[PDB]
Design a protein around this ligand. Structure first.
Ligand SMILES: *[C@@H]1O[C@H](CO)[C@@H](O)[C@H](O)[C@H]1NC(C)=O
Length: 289
């Protein structure tokens, strides 16, 4: 009749680390006690046990089963058995399961993509139990591809993709793999560009000598396109009568003159390419001299 005080509790351990089970008992008598541990109903001979004694004023003896450098083979159901000259006491059964920290097999890398195309992000990890993959943009969740349900994943090939890439999709994306052991994460910067284009069409104009004409070239694209104006096929020579906004988008010519007639070309460029828009300016002449 050795009466158990502390019973071994079910626990989890990471592979490679040490773990321990403890049960402690105290006999009604002073007859010596013997501790045993039986895994899956088969004892460990050559087992690593360590024994302690407590002096409560009762002599409580504690036994510790050391499991050094745990592997998957250590996985099982453990129990402590205490024997004296009276009888044997049996403890609760404690389960031991094992962890393996997640390790990346595929990480996303920095890419530069155009608008309206499809961006692909690879990300996979091993580990026990199998890790779940989570995503972040700039450290959060309020990002357009998620909010607009445009981000998806291939079913069995571990590939994430975004359809119809917006400008606001650009930023740092963080891939995070997590299980019951821990978390790891990898960054990838998505950079989104757009070829230059015209917002509103550039229309032909017809004005009379002395009137004022205005040509607007509202250009989009990323990076913001540099705008250059041309008359004929030479760069536009500016006068006191010519006006430009700093962005060069609005071109105004006051007091139009016969020499002003001709084709005005709007040239929009960035690192992706160049687009052009044309406007024919016709002038209604009353008298040349
Ligand atoms: C991942 O990105 C976050 C936020 O951009 C940053 O704080 C962290 O240092 C990055 N980690 C690495 C390894 O670059």
């Amino acid at each position: 009749k050795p009466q158990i005080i502390t019973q071994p509790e079910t626990t989890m351990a990471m592979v490679g680390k040490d773990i321990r089970f403890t049960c402690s008992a105290a006999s009604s008598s002073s007859s010596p006690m013997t501790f045993a541990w039986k895994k899956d109903n088969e004892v460990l001979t050559n087992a690593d046990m360590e024994n302690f004694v407590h002096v409560h004023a009762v002599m409580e003896y504690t036994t510790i089963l050391h499991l050094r450098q745990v592997t998957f083979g250590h996985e099982g159901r453990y129990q402590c058995v205490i024997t004296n000259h009276f009888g044997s006491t049996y403890s609760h059964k404690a389960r031991l399961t094992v962890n393996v920290l997640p390790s990346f097999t595929k990480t996303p890398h920095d890419i530069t993509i155009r608008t309206t195309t499809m961006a692909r992000l690879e990300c996979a990890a091993t580990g026990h139990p199998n890790p779940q993959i989570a995503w972040q943009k700039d450290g959060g969740t309020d990002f357009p591809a998620a909010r607009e349900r445009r981000m998806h994943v291939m079913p069995d090939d571990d590939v994430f993709f975004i359809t119809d890439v917006k400008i606001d999709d650009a930023g740092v994306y963080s891939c995070t793999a997590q299980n019951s052991a821990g978390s790891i994460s990898a960054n990838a910067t998505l950079t989104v560009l757009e070829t230059p284009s015209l917002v509103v069409p550039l229309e032909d104009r017809v004005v009379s000598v002395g009137e004022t004409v205005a040509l607007q070239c509202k250009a989009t694209g990323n990076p913001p396109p540099r705008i250059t104006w041309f008359k004929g096929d030479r760069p536009l020579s500016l006068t006191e009568r010519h006006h430009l906004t700093p962005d060069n988008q609005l071109l105004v010519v006051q007091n139009v003159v016969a020499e002003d007639a001709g084709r005005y070309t709007c040239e929009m460029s960035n690192t992706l390419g160049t687009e052009r828009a044309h406007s024919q300016l016709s002038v209604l002449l009353e008298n040349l001299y």
